[PDB]
Motif scaffolding. Sequence first.
Motif, PDB file in Angstrom:
ATOM      1  N   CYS A  40     -75.969  11.838  -5.619  1.00  0.00           N
ATOM      2  CA  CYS A  40     -74.612  12.290  -5.945  1.00  0.00           C
ATOM      3  C   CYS A  40     -73.868  12.676  -4.666  1.00  0.00           C
ATOM      4  O   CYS A  40     -74.442  13.325  -3.797  1.00  0.00           O
ATOM      5  N   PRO A  41     -72.592  12.262  -4.539  1.00  0.00           N
ATOM      6  CA  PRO A  41     -71.809  12.671  -3.366  1.00  0.00           C
ATOM      7  C   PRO A  41     -71.600  14.179  -3.300  1.00  0.00           C
ATOM      8  O   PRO A  41     -71.511  14.837  -4.337  1.00  0.00           O
ATOM      9  N   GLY A  42     -71.512  14.714  -2.086  1.00  0.00           N
ATOM     10  CA  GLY A  42     -71.349  16.152  -1.885  1.00  0.00           C
ATOM     11  C   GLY A  42     -72.682  16.844  -1.682  1.00  0.00           C
ATOM     12  O   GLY A  42     -73.737  16.204  -1.727  1.00  0.00           O
ATOM     13  N   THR A  66     -70.969   9.037 -16.470  1.00  0.00           N
ATOM     14  CA  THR A  66     -70.725   7.905 -17.369  1.00  0.00           C
ATOM     15  C   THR A  66     -71.644   6.759 -16.979  1.00  0.00           C
ATOM     16  O   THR A  66     -71.781   6.458 -15.793  1.00  0.00           O
ATOM     17  N   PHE A  75     -64.954  -0.459 -14.059  1.00  0.00           N
ATOM     18  CA  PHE A  75     -64.995   0.924 -13.614  1.00  0.00           C
ATOM     19  C   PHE A  75     -63.530   1.375 -13.561  1.00  0.00           C
ATOM     20  O   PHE A  75     -62.794   1.041 -12.625  1.00  0.00           O
ATOM     21  N   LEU A  76     -63.101   2.108 -14.587  1.00  0.00           N
ATOM     22  CA  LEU A  76     -61.706   2.553 -14.690  1.00  0.00           C
ATOM     23  C   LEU A  76     -61.554   3.991 -14.176  1.00  0.00           C
ATOM     24  O   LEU A  76     -61.775   4.955 -14.910  1.00  0.00           O
ATOM     25  N   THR A  78     -59.592   7.054 -13.508  1.00  0.00           N
ATOM     26  CA  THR A  78     -58.383   7.667 -14.040  1.00  0.00           C
ATOM     27  C   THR A  78     -57.801   8.665 -13.042  1.00  0.00           C
ATOM     28  O   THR A  78     -58.532   9.224 -12.221  1.00  0.00           O
ATOM     29  N   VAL A  86     -61.122  13.363  -3.440  1.00  0.00           N
ATOM     30  CA  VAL A  86     -61.508  13.145  -4.831  1.00  0.00           C
ATOM     31  C   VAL A  86     -62.585  12.071  -4.915  1.00  0.00           C
ATOM     32  O   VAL A  86     -62.589  11.129  -4.123  1.00  0.00           O
ATOM     33  N   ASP A  87     -63.496  12.224  -5.874  1.00  0.00           N
ATOM     34  CA  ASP A  87     -64.569  11.256  -6.114  1.00  0.00           C
ATOM     35  C   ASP A  87     -64.568  10.797  -7.563  1.00  0.00           C
ATOM     36  O   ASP A  87     -64.242  11.568  -8.465  1.00  0.00           O
ATOM     37  N   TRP A  88     -64.928   9.533  -7.769  1.00  0.00           N
ATOM     38  CA  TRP A  88     -65.264   9.008  -9.083  1.00  0.00           C
ATOM     39  C   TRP A  88     -66.629   8.401  -8.981  1.00  0.00           C
ATOM     40  O   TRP A  88     -66.886   7.617  -8.061  1.00  0.00           O
ATOM     41  N   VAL A  89     -67.515   8.745  -9.912  1.00  0.00           N
ATOM     42  CA  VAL A  89     -68.892   8.243  -9.890  1.00  0.00           C
ATOM     43  C   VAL A  89     -69.310   7.768 -11.277  1.00  0.00           C
ATOM     44  O   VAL A  89     -69.041   8.437 -12.270  1.00  0.00           O
ATOM     45  N   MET A  90     -69.952   6.605 -11.343  1.00  0.00           N
ATOM     46  CA  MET A  90     -70.577   6.144 -12.587  1.00  0.00           C
ATOM     47  C   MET A  90     -71.866   5.381 -12.314  1.00  0.00           C
ATOM     48  O   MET A  90     -72.169   5.032 -11.172  1.00  0.00           O
ATOM     49  N   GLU A 104     -64.315   6.813  -3.453  1.00  0.00           N
ATOM     50  CA  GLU A 104     -63.976   8.025  -2.718  1.00  0.00           C
ATOM     51  C   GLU A 104     -62.542   7.928  -2.211  1.00  0.00           C
ATOM     52  O   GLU A 104     -62.151   6.925  -1.614  1.00  0.00           O
TER      53      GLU A 104
END
Lengths: 187, 13
Positions: A40-42, A66, A75-76, A78, A86-90, A104
């Motif tokens: 996981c990032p961070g 998710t 990979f949507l 939002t 900001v990060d989005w991870v799936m 990222e």
Amino acid sequence: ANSVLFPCKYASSGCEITLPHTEKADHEELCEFRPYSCPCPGASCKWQGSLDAVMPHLMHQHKSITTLQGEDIVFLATDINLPGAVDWVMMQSCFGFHFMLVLEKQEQQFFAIVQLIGTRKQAENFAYRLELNGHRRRLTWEATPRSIHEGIATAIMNSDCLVFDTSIAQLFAENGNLGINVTISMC
Amino acid sequence: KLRPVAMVRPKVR
Ligand SMILES: [Zn+2]
Ligand SMILES: [Zn+2]
């Protein structure tokens, strides 16, 4: 005695590499017998263990990720226009493996990359494709996924991934969301 | 290609 070969610090878990002091530290960072850390990032999770412990760790400590089954997904991400870091991870699951997909936003540019929950050698069997689709527009990045053993920080740092900015994001975003087509294949 | 769509919410560091 002209010189001496020193054993890898990970010999205790099975590593048989023995090298001069000058190229020992280099191997030890790359060594496959090195413990795996949290993908996981961070830094809010500082867990470490065996490769086959990684998914259990994610399943127990990071339940909100998710996950989709299939070699072809969307990979949507939002709320893309959010300011700051900001990060989005799936998770994408296919071919009997699990892949972490990361977008990222740095405080501004976007970096999108895929990593395999698996070894460096395992990662070499795979190619991934990230693609952004608009009206008669397509930006595509294709590469070998990184092993979580290596991680993505260095790759992101050298722009070795899909890299775009907030202006490019606007050409592809719908209603403040960006659909990234992710395809994983065996090569 | 058959593509399931996952809506992913952002995470702030
Ligand atoms: Zn070693
Ligand atoms: Zn963790």
